[model samples]
Target: RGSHMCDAFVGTWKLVSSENFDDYMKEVGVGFATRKVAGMAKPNMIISVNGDVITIKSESTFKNTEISFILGQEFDEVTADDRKVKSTITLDGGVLVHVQKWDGKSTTIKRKREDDKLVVECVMKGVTSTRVYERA
Candidate 1:
């Protein structure tokens, strides 16, 4: 586990909108079958923070994934299928920004609060997609 000084994330959120879900899977090189399933499903995110440590979990009827990290510190992240990642997160203007390094590829995700809405932007492989959420 890594360490930091402050924590700005300590609440629950719900999914509201997502753009280019199918396109995201396609960019990730996910196969047709997985893309089909992912496109049809509404994924949810649950993020919690304790001190500088944070845990982000995304769930759907078809899949559930989670990652724990410390602010400003890099850690090893392994997906359900054992895909390895090196990632770090930071708080910027009340937004949680995560940069994931995987297999020589880097993906950046930014989560921000807009009024009562939570906006998530995923940038990878030269493509950027946005997902929005609301308080539960």
Candidate 2:
């Protein structure tokens, strides 16, 4: 975490738009069948802070995932794609930086505020995807 407060990230957000997500998932080694299913699903992200801990919930009709952690602490996580990885999150300015590592591969996801929307950028193997969310 940086010196900035993470308040901007604490809220319920609903997905409004997405771009290049399929390619991003492919870069992350997700199976084709699973990617097809995931591509059509829109997920809501609910984030809340409690003292030094932060909890993130990803809700969707297809699959729901949740995680709780302190800033900068790595923990084992089973992702929406069902991959086991070591994950960690940090607050950088008004943005939330999340990194996941599995085997010898990794991906980075950054969530930040843009005007009235919450924007998420996902990157893996140089393939990048952007998703926008509105307050829910």
Candidate 3:
């Protein structure tokens, strides 16, 4: 079978919507004061894909993170703000799913295209936050 790709997600994207940001931060153990500021910032993501390798950089005034990996390959990811995660990605029904292995737990990140938006769902520590991005 042929591999699935996100041709629509291969460029720079700006943050548009973020849902449950406060709750997500709480679940991730972020302090209340930090969460307040982080929740208000609009983060941007730049992604580039070449063949089976994908690189993603997410940045905001408060934090930034960069990750790169080939499809189906596992690698270490250190959040731009210094969080640590070991991750691997796979394609499921044309959507990219990232499984982050951290602290002996797994957090799943689902990324897909919806119309002109790139939707991202991060599931971790019993909390789920959804964010949307638009082409920049």
Candidate 4:
């Protein structure tokens, strides 16, 4: 579990921009064409924090994905990229950090609020991608 103040993350966020997402797709096994298609879509996330359980509902023109999990507890997850993984999410300094492992590779996702915006940083195979979102 993170800070009791983690309620700071409960809101609807619209994707405004992203960085280094191409390389992140490469490491996540996304094909060149798929990456191209996926990058063209803007996704919005509705994050609901309930006690130690958090559920994220992602909506996009490409596809929608939802994940629910308990803090520090391992669970199986599949991303929009189609990678299946064993994942765990925890809190670090107000950020919800998600660690995912699949096919001997791993990805780290950090989500936090900055002022009125939401920042999501994804690290895969040493390549880091950041997605910035605005409150919706």
Best by TM-score: 2
Name model 3 segments beyond 4 Å from true: 1-4
Which ten-residue region of model 3 has the weakest summed lDDT? Answer: 1-10
Top-scoring candidate (lDDT): 2
lDDT of 1 by residue, 110-134 (tens): 9876776778898877788888887
lDDT of 4 by residue, 27-98 (tens): 778988789989988998998887777899999988899999999999999888787899999999889999
* Models ranked on lDDT: 2, 4, 3, 1
TM-score of 4: 0.93
Q: CA lDDT of 5 in candidate 4?
A: 70
For all candidates, what are the clash counts? Answer: 0, 0, 2, 0
List the lowest-lDDT window of 10 residues for candidate 4.
1-10
Winner on TM-score (3 vs 4): 4
lDDT of 2 by residue, 1-136 (tens): 5433777778899999999999999999999999999999889999888888888899997789999999899999999999999999887876789999999888999989899899999999789999999999
- By lDDT, the better pick of 3 and 4 is 4
In the order shown, the candidates' Cα RMSDs to the true structure are 3.6, 2.5, 2.7, 2.2
Candidates in order have lDDT scores of 0.73, 0.91, 0.81, 0.89
Task: Compute each candidate's TM-score over C-alphas.
Answer: 0.81, 0.94, 0.86, 0.93
Evaluation by TM-score, superior candidate among 2 and 4: 2
